[PDB]
Amino acid sequence: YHETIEQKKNNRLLEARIFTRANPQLSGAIRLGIERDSVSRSYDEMFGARSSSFVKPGSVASMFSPAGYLTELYREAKDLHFSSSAYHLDNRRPDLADLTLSQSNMDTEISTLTLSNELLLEHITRKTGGDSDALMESLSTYRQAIDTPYHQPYETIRQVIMTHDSTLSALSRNPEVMGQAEGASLLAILANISPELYNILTEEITEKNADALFAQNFSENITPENFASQSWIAKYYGLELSEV
Amino acid sequence: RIQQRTVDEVDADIAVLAESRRSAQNRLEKYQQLYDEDINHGEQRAMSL
Amino acid sequence: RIQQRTVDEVDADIAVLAESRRSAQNRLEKYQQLYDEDINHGEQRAMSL
Amino acid sequence: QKYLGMLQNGYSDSTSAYVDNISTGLVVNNESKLEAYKITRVKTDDYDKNINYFDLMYEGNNQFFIRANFKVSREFGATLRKNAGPSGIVGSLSGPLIANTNFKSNYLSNISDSEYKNGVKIYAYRYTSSTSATNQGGGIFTFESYPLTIFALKLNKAIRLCLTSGLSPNELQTIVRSDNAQGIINDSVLTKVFYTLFYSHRYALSFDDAQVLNGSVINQYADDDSVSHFNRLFNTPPLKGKIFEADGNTVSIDPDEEQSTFARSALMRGLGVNSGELYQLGKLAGVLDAQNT
Amino acid sequence: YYTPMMCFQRLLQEKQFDEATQWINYVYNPAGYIVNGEIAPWIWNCRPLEETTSWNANPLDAIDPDAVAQNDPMHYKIATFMRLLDQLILRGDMAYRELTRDALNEAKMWYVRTLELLGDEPEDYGSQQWAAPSLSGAASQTVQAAYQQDLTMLGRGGVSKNLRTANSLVGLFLPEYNPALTDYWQTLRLRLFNLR
Amino acid sequence: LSATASQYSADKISRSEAYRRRRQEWEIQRDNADGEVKQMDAQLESLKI
Amino acid sequence: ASALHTMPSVIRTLVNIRYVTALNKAESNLPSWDEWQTLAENMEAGLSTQQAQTLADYTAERLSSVLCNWFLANIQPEGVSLHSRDDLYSYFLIDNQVSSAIKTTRLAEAIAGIQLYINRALNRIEPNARADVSTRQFFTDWTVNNRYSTWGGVSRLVYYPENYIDPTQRIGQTRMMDELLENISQSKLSRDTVE
Amino acid sequence: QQAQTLADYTAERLSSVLCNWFLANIQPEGVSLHSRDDLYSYFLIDNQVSSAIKTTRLAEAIAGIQLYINRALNRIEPNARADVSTRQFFTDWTVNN
C-alpha cells in the first residue's frame, strides 16, 4: 500500500514537472532560463502533442474543471455499494454512466425540475412499457392517488384562461355567453376539477356498489379498515393531523 | 420653450443623483475592502509577539 | 415685478450653493494634505526609538 | 471559424466536425485536381435530445454519416431523407447503437447533386424496439465545392463585405442565398445589404428582422452558442413540440376548419395573429392554395 | 533567496519601488549583472535557481506549496518573475493615477515594459481537438492504469516502442493555463486600451 | 530580557498599524469630500438651468 | 373571443363542455382525448412568449408533483422502502420539490447528486455501504474533497504552487527569519533600516 | 468643430492604412516585424493611439529613445553592445529612466 501511494505521488510530481516546462505562457522572457529535459522529450515522443495542448480555464477539457471533479467523484463512489444492493449508484441512476462530458453539458442552462421530470418519466415508462403520451392519457383517468387524475390539456386550458382573465370579469360582463355554461363547468374553470375528478365527486354511492366503488377508487393494497387510523389518512391525503 | 427647459432641469437632477451614487458606491467598496481584510499581518504579528 | 423677484431668489440660491462648495473644497484640501503627509517625523522618530 | 467552420486535419476519431460548419481542402482522386469544400448544417427537431453529433462527411464524390448518441439502444437506425416515404431511405447505421460511440454510415446513396445544395440529408429513424422507430433528430446539410483559388476569391469577397458592412457571415450568406443559388455578390445583393442596414437604422429592428424585410427568408443558422431566428420566432418555448420548415406538407389555414392543426397553431403564435388575421395574411400574400391551404 | 524576496515584498507593500527593485535584483534582473565591469553570463543571480537544485524529496507528504517549490525550484523562478511583473504593474498604476501628461507617459512606459517582459499570450490549443467521453469512459480504471504505467516507465527509462500513443485511446483531461498570468495579460490590455 | 524585547517590538508594530488604519480613514474622508464637490458642481448646472 | 385572445369557434367549443354527472340524468358531453389536445393547442396559441414560459413553469411543477405521487404509489425498488418526496429526493439524487425558477447545468446537477450520495453512504445513513471502500484516500480527505472549490485548490497546488507562495511566511521558516520580518514590519522602511 | 472631427477621423484611418501598407510591402534590413505593435517597437512611436492624445516633438523623441533603451538593455533587441550597456548612465538606469 505504501509503495503504491509513493508511486502515485511520484507520477503526479513528474506530470507537473513536465507541464510546467511545456507551458506556452512562459515563452516568455523567463524562457531564457528554461531547459528541455530528456524526460520532457520522451513524454513528447510518446504522447504526441499532449504536453502542448494547454486549454484555457473554464473549458470542459481541463483537468481542474467540473468535468474532472465529477470524474473523480464518480470513479471513487462507483464502488461504495455492492452491485447487488438497490442503493448502488448505477442501479438508482443508470444515466450517470452514460452522461457525456461535453462543453454543451457543462455550460448550457436548464431547470432542475426539467431534469427531475425527465428522470421520473424515464423510470415510469420503463415500468409501464408505454410512451409518454400513453402515460399522460392514463394519468388523465388514474384515480388511485391524491394528485390524480391529471388532465394535462384541461389544466393547460384552465391556466390559459386564468392568465387571460382572472376573476372571470369578461365572462361576467357578457351574460349571453355566460348563460350557456353549466355551473359545474364554471366550477371547473374557477378550480381544478378534471372530468374524471368530477365523475369521482358526483358518482352516487349505494351499499350494493360500495365495494366495487372502493376497489375502483383505491389501490389494491388499501382496505376499508385502513380508514380506522387517522395517521394513515393524513399520510395518504398529504394532510396534517390537525387538518385530518 | 419654457417646458423644454423644465425637462432639461430634471435631466440635470438625474446627473446630480448619478454623482451622489458614485460617491456612495466608492464608500461601499472601501468599507467592504476594510471588512474583508480584517486583521492584517502586522496586527497578527504584534499579537503573536 | 413678481417674476423678477423670483429670478433674484434663484440667484440667491446659486450663492448659497457657492458657499456650500467653498466649505466642501476646504475639507477636500485639508484631507488631501493629511493623507499625502501620512506619518510625520515625530511619529517616525517614536517608532524608531 | 464563423466563415470557415472546422478544418479537417486528422483529429481524434469522434471530436465532432462542426462549429457549426465543416470545410477542408481535398485532392480529387478521379483526376489530378485539388478542390476545397464546405458543408453547413441546420439542426433539425429533437436534436439536443439524443445525438451527441450527426455529421455529414465528404470523401471526394460520395458522402457518409458519422453519428454519436446520448442514449443506448439495442437496435439499428435508418437514415432516411423523406417523411418516411417509400423512396426516403438514403442509408443505414448498423447497431447496437451505444451512447458516446462513433458510428459510420455506409456511403449514403439516394441523394442527388442538385439537392446536395439546401437538401436535408437527415432522418434518424432510430429503432427503439423491434417494431417501434422514432425520429431522433438531425439537420439540413448544404454542400459547396470549388477549386482552391475560386474558394479563396469567394472567401475574400465575403470577408471584405462582412468587415466593411458589419453584417454577420450567416446573415450575408442568407442574403446571397435568397438572391441566387451560386452565392455570388452583385448589385442586387449590395442593394439588399443597403436596405438591411437602412431598415435596421430606421425601424430600430434587428439585423434578422431587417433582412426578412429586405426580401430574404427567415434565417435558420445557429452559431453553436445562439438561437436561430426561426427557432426564436417559433420554438421559444415550443407549444409542446417543434415546428420546423422541414415539413413541406400542406396545412389548411381556413378559419372555418374543425379540428385545427398544430402547424397552424404554431404559425399563428409565431406571427402573433389569430385565425382570421392569418387568413387575411394568406390572402394578401397570395400563398394560398386549393382548399385554403 | 528567501531573505531578499521577503525584503522586496515588504518594500513593495510599503511602496518603496526603487529599493524593492534593488532588493529583487539580487535574485533576478532582466538586464543581467555587472561582474568585473562586464555582463555576467548567467541569467539568474541565485545559484540554486540557475542550476535548478532540488532539496526536498518528499513534497507531497503534506499540502505545502513551498515544499513543492523546494522539490522543483522552477516554481521559484516563476514566482520571482511574477513578483517582478506585479511590481511593474503597481508602478504603472501609481503613475497613471496622477493624471499629468508626464505621468501618463510614465504609465505607458511601465505597461510597455511589462508587456515586453511577458511576451505574446498564447491561444487555446487542445479544446477543440478534445473528444468528449462518457462519465464511465473517463472514470475507466483501464485508461487510468494505462496512463499511470506509461508515467511509471517514463520516470525511469523512456522506452517508446510504438512511439505514437494512438490518440484514439485518450480519454484524459488536458493541462490548463495559469489564471494569474492571464490576469496579467488582461490587465495590461485594459490599461493600454485606456491609455491609447 | 527576551520578554521585554518582544513587548517593545509588539508595541512598535501596533503603533505602525494604528497609523496605517488612520491613514485609510483619512483616505475615505478625502473621497467623501471629493464626491461632495463634484455633486455641488452638478447642482450648479441644475440651478443655472 | 377577443378577451380570451381566440375565436368564437373556440369559445363555443369551450362552452359546449358540460358536466351533467354522467348519468342520473340524460348524459354528459365531453370531448375525446385528441379533441382535448386540439383545444389545448388552440387556446395556448394565443399567449405571448412570457405567458408561454409562465405556463410551462406551472406545467413543470404540476407534473413533478403528479409523477412523484404516481411513483410513490405504484413503484417500489428492489430493496428500498421510500415513503415521501424527500425519500424520492434522497433516492434519485435530484430534488423534485424545487421551483421551476431555479436553474442549473447537467454536470452541476450530476456533481450535486453524487456528492449527496457520497455523504449519505459515508455517514452510515444508507445501509450496507462497503466499509473497505469508504477508507480510500478520497473519502479520508472528504473534508476538502466534498466541495469543488476546495478540491480544485488542493489539486492546483501541485501544478501551480507559485500562486500560493508567500514571501513573508512559509512552513519551516527559521526563528531569525521571523525576527527579521518583525524588524522590518514597520510602515516607513528606509534603505538604511532594511540594511 | 466638424472640420477638426473630420481631420481626426482621417488621421486615424490613414494611420491604419499606412501601417498595413508598410507591413505588407516593406521589410527592413534584418528585422522581422509582423504587427502594429512590432511597428511601434521598431519606429519608437505609437501608431495605435487615438487622435485625442497630444504631445510635443521633444517629449515624443524622449519617449521613443527611452523605449529603445529599455528594449536594448533588457536583451529584447538582439546584438546589443554589452560593453556600451555597462556605462554609468545605464548602470544608474533606475533613476535615469
Residue numbers in the entry:
A (entry chain A): 50 to 293
B (entry chain B), C (entry chain C): 2100 to 2148
D (entry chain B): 294 to 586
E (entry chain A): 1807 to 2002
F (entry chain C): 2198 to 2246
G (entry chain A): 880 to 1074
H (entry chain B): 929 to 1025
From the paper:
Of these are a class of multi-protein ABC toxin complexes (Tcs) that have multiple receptor binding domains on the shell of the A subunit (TcA) for recognizing and binding target cells. The Xenorhabdus nematophilus TcA, XptA2, has thus far only displayed toxicity to insects. Here we report the high-resolution structure of the Xenorhabdus nematophilus TcA XptA2 by X-ray crystallography and cryo-EM, each at 3.1 Å resolution. XptA2 forms a 17.5-nm-wide, 24-nm-long pentamer with a molecular mass of ~1.4 megadaltons (MDa).
